[PDB]
Design a protein around this nucleic acid. Sequence first.
DNA 1: GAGAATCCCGGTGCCGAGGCCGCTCAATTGGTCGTAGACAGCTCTAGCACCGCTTAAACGCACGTACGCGCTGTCCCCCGCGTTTTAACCGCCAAGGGGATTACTCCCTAGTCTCCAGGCACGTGTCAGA
DNA 2: TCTGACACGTGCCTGGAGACTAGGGAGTAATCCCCTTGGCGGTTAAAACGCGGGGGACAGCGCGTACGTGCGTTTAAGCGGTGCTAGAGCTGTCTACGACCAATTGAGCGGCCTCGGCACCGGGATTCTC
Lengths: 93, 93, 162, 94, 87, 81, 85, 101, 102
Amino acid sequence: VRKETYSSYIYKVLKQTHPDTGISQKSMSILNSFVNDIFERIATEASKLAAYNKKSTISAREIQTAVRLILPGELAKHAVSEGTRAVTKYSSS
Amino acid sequence: VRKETYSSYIYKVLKQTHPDTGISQKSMSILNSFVNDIFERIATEASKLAAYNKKSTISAREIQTAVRLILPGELAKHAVSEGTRAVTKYSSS
Amino acid sequence: AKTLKDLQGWEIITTDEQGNIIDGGQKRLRRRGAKTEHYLKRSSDGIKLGRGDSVVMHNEAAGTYSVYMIQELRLNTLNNVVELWALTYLRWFNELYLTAELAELQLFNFIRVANVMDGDFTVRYICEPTGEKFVDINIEDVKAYIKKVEPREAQEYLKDLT
Amino acid sequence: HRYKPGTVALREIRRFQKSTELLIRKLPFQRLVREIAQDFKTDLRFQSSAIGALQESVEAYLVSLFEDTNLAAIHAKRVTIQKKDIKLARRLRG
Amino acid sequence: VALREIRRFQKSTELLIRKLPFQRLVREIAQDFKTDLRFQSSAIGALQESVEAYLVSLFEDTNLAAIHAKRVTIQKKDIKLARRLRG
Amino acid sequence: ILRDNIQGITKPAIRRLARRGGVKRISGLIYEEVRAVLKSFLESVIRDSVTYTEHAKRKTVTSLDVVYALKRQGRTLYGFG
Amino acid sequence: RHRKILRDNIQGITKPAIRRLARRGGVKRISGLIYEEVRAVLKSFLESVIRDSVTYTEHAKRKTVTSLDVVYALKRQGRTLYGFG
Amino acid sequence: QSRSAKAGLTFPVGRVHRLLRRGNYAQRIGSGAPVYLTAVLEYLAAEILELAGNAARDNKKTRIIPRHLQLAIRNDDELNKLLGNVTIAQGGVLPNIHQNL
Amino acid sequence: QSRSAKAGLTFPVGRVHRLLRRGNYAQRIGSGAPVYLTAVLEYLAAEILELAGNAARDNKKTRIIPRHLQLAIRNDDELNKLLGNVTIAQGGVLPNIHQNLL
DNA sequence: GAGAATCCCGGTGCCGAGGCCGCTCAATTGGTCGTAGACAGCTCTAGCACCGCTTAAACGCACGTACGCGCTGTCCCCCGCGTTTTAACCGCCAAGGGGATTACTCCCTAGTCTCCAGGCACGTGTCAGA
DNA sequence: TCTGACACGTGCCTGGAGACTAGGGAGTAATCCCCTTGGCGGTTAAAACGCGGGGGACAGCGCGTACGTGCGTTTAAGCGGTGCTAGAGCTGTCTACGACCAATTGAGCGGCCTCGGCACCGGGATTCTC
């Protein structure tokens, strides 16, 4: 009771590209823990970086900086390229 | 302008036991950064630990457990021995 | 350009290997072989800004126009949505010199493409910021090289040339 | 007279190990840092404090790495380090 | 048998340290603080998996050190280095 | 009451762990040392988890505090917290 | 302006500088296959740390890198420095 | 129609927003920050599931197991650096053979 | 008087309380948390300054330069473990020689 | 069979710190509204602990052999000394990139009703393994 | 060719959106400074270059104690079935505790002297190699 997880949406996006394959219960917990840990790391990094510049309003730029520092390699350059795809789809719509 | 530092208090506690030995400004900055880093580590550990048990406030026991976590060895057993003493005569005053 | 307001007249085209597709740009799949490029073209005339071209821009302080040969572009940065690293040309003040220094090119400083080649202008030799050490080397021989490989090996190559 | 190789080395070790002065030259290190940052983007402003902080951090990291490589070499019945020792030290810490 | 065991074990998944000795060892190492301490069933498995990962990493590190040392036999000095080389 | 059980992890277990590690030949002098390694690592982790549990007003050490202690030491574990 | 460029200053950390660094390390002698790779290791470490510091300093609409952000970047990597931040 | 559907992201926006606000991370969290975090998390999940499926297809299996996840995260070198200090449960180890055996 | 003198210490409880409040760390802060944190910080400062003074007395010096501070931060065997991967500016290296070097 | 790499008598520059001044700014008193958890009860649940039926594996014993550290020879190559050389730092000029604080205002939004919504507690029809 | 787990319809209630005030903050556009590159001339602590040399890395060996493979026999293990009770997580109190509202006062960092501790000298001893 009162268990907030990301299982449903991760499973839906699992059938977003390869609906033929499934996922086990144990590996799903591994993925949920990994995504929770990386989200916590990004949030902590963003808050810590914002507190360093006398900033108390966490906006898109702080999260972008935190994630690009956390994400290593050119993959980060790709991931950031996805983020601005959403806000442009959010402000316009 | 408005340069935050702990120089006066560290110097005052230095004269509490070592009235004859001075300290340089370069080393004073080192001690100030050391105090700030230990403080930040304890505070972030206490906040994360409070978030683990759905806690809403940080009490004396929160920081006590945080310093028990961070401080290694018998020194930690001394630190709490110096901590809970003060509160023992802080509330009853 | 800075915000999206200054870059409202441009689009993004993703050339995976040799295609003119959009596909959104790195939609969902990333793996080995990520040498894809993203380029932009204004809608007024329809001229594309590839990786290895050359443009002309005016300086806010100097005032005199200068030719910059674009070497690389990075999309979705912190201060700028697109950041263009180019090589400056040492103006004589019509033969143009070449420098190996990297400079940032802004969107609103671009007015017209300068398709210079070895002999609307002509190049003479590559020079240095010190004012000497000029070698008779053209640009058409290195444009294909910098277009075929990653930018990194491109700057080691151009350093090895000098 | 000329000292045999292996006696000035030891007092050299103490004389650079007891003290803590800056050995890496400040201006070349600043130039290297500026040129490395230029590979990210041009027209960047650097102050003396940041250069000093970077130099101190590099000093500490390289001293730690060299101590680790010396330990690895002396563990292998050896007194000098080669690229294999550096690779072993690097792969086991990051 | 060792040569086949190499990729028999790197392909395997089942745990090696037996659960019952691990439970008793944890009980004895935890009673040194307070008497009658309780542990969850899944906590024991998680801790054993962590111990597995740490020991596998340490043994890979000492294998690298040994093959660097022109030898295939690891000893106590190798693990002492493994502590003293990375911390 | 319960003693002389540190030898629960016996030498064939260390041999199997070494085979998974990627070695072929191991000396017999490393068994006591790896036992001490396990003892020290487990003592540290158990101390951290016990402090977590004591703060949490619990007495049954669950997986959550163990994973949190692992995360605090830079050894984050997935699938259990 | 920016009419200045350095051509391959990777050897800025010179040979006897590496020698003295190793001497502080506590070694007896250094082979010739070190001076060419330690500079590459230093270059990679700088390419990481300076990039992190550049992100820190340009996050806040600034082009002048301070020492506070450098200290914070080293702290994020587990190699924190005291007294400069 | 929903906030997540407006940006076209499968991952939630309200859930992550409330977890940030109740998470004692910041008293003030922006409007574009949650959607940006949702987008980057969705991209990371898509990439890791792509790698897991690629690894699973080579083992002739139609399910995602921790062994496949660890194999995929270890083959990817830039993702390995981020997942350096982690311990995958029931995932085995990455096979590797040196040049001195 | 202030709570700093009430607790019988020399470190500011009010300053750490205010900057904890402004540090975006917790919505609510207990009454005993600032005083306990001040106590532990004062104890750590006293320990490190005492170690630095002891190191200075061995070198026949009065001013504490970072060398003696590094000696203090590394000589103590449980206190050094806390600062496992720290970098001290102008700190130096521990005076020691392994027997396999001479 | 004898040199330096410094020690310590002792004066002064010389940068640096401890009193001395000094004044906006946050610490202190404590109802009040909100708020959150120590008790108070409970409740169900899961592994301690035991018992029992099977069962993979350790404890050495024996032995061939991959292996390891010292021997001995070979070369090798980096360090110390002598000579050349080479640019950092001293001390500034000096304007220029960029920052110490208003401000604002208008839109981002906390709060709060407010209206609605979605996915997990189940679950029986399917599907990787032996 | 037979299974134990995994996945679609399934409701509502805690949560996600819908929407109207007023806190309240930032990139626009402003003062004068806060550090800093470029280079002006010399040089002196190092940086390169040549060369001699001796400690050490490389390579085969056969002694030689040490172990994996082959092999009994227990020995604790691998799982099924319960008796059961300490405890994690469930709602409710209400009374102790946080933020903040007026209002006030000691303080600790901007500036300024007034000393204050160390380096380097003329010039001895100090444990270094053979």
